[PDB]
Design a protein around this ligand. Structure first.
Ligand SMILES: CCCCCCCC/C=C\CCCCCCCC(=O)OC[C@H](O)CO
Ligand SMILES: [Zn+2]
Lengths: 353, 17
């Protein structure tokens, strides 16, 4: 049906992009400061993925003022073909690297909390060092079709030089939509669907082990572990503390079930990673859903009024998805105690001198 | 330089992001 050229929504979206740049440069730079200053054997298993996540966000945040200009100029790129190629490449590099850093953080919690294989093969620091190298190789290779296909051209008969994906090089005469639906679906799959499913499965197994809560005796100090149980007292290994018959007492001091305290493990790392995934899911979900509904709209012959709704909601969907870059340093300020303590350490000593 | 333009009809364009 009828389709007009993409126009500017207002001054709201370009102003947010400038704010995300300002908060993202200083914010992610403060994250990279705290991790690299604390070297030696003091580094956490999660720190390697946090530092790379800060690198991915920082490099993309610098390209946002160029995109803020593009939005307000009603989608017209005045920075040339080279900057269009580099700016668009760093969007998808960030998209893949940030999603792979989150899976890395989630899998690091899986290997630590669940422990499927013995500590000999486990090698948490080695596995983290290998996966961080692979994710940077994967993100750079998966974002390469964006580096090649992007050019500054006059899309349709509209007098505007815009930064777009040119399929005239790879696609034939009719298979123009095939390459957009091909590279578009795979981008959402390897950049959001597959990563988010790994994060959720990792959390399901982590929750499965945490569910078996240990109980400590307040009288002597005996810790009942559901994994070990008490086979001598007629309690099979695997049985939960609540499932234990009421006649059972402490095998070391002989006190009833009422004198046992439930232990709530101080899992700080899990809390930091959970909030990072939750925010990422809330920021990236609308962008990927609207784009998929746009693909599955022209193919399934969806009503014309629905395509108009997706087009007007999309600039706001990309906006909040880009806010995610400057969102993490604020999340570490409210949930990560080690980041909080390291920032305050350079506050009293650094400024004084 | 930069200049604001009136809407023009066209084909289904792929999302600009
Ligand atoms: C090599 C295979 C790479 C497969 C992933 C391609 C991702 C890509 O280039 O996506 C373009 C994007 O959809 C534009 O909006
Ligand atoms: Zn006891």
């Amino acid at each position: 049906c009828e389709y007009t050229d993409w126009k500017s929504s207002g001054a709201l979206i370009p102003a947010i992009y400038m704010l995300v740049f300002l908060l993202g440069t200083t914010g992610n730079g403060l994250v990279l400061w705290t991790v690299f200053r604390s070297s030696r054997e003091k580094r956490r298993s999660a720190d390697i993925f946090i530092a790379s996540l800060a690198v991915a966000d920082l490099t993309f945040v610098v390209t946002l003022p160029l995109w803020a200009t593009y939005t307000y100029r009603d989608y017209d790129w005045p920075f040339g073909t080279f900057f269009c190629k580099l700016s668009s490449y760093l969007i998808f590099v960030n998209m893949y690297a940030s999603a792979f850093c989150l899976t890395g953080l989630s899998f690091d919690r899986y290997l630590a909390i669940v422990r499927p294989v013995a500590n000999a093969r486990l090698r948490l620091r080695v596995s983290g060092a290998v996966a961080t190298a692979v994710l940077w190789v994967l993100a750079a290779l998966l974002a390469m079709p964006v580096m090649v296909l992007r050019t500054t051209g006059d899309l349709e008969n509209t007098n505007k030089v815009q930064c777009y994906m040119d399929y005239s090089m790879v696609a034939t005469v009719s298979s123009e939509w095939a390459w957009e639906v091909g590279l578009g679906v795979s981008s959402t799959t390897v950049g959001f669907v597959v990563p988010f499913t790994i994060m959720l499965t990792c959390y399901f197994f982590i929750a499965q082990t945490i569910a078996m809560k240990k109980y400590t005796c307040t009288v002597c100090g005996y810790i009942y572990n559901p994994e070990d149980g008490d086979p001598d007292n007629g309690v099979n290994p695997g049985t939960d503390f609540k499932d234990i018959p009421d006649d059972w007492v402490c095998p070391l001091c002989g006190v009833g079930k009422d004198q046992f305290e439930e232990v709530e493990e101080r899992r700080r790392l899990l809390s930091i990673i959970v909030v990072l995934v939750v925010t990422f899911a809330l920021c990236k979900m609308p962008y990927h859903l609207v784009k998929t509904l746009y693909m599955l709209g022209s193919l399934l012959h969806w009503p014309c009024d629905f395509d108009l709704f997706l087009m007007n909601i999309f600039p706001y969907c990309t906006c909040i998805s880009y806010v995610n870059s400057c969102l993490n340093p604020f999340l570490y300020a409210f949930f990560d105690p080690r980041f909080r303590q390291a920032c305050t350490s350079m506050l009293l000593m650094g400024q004084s001198r | 330089k930069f200049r604001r333009q009136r809407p023009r009809a066209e084909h289904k364009k792929x999302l600009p992001f």
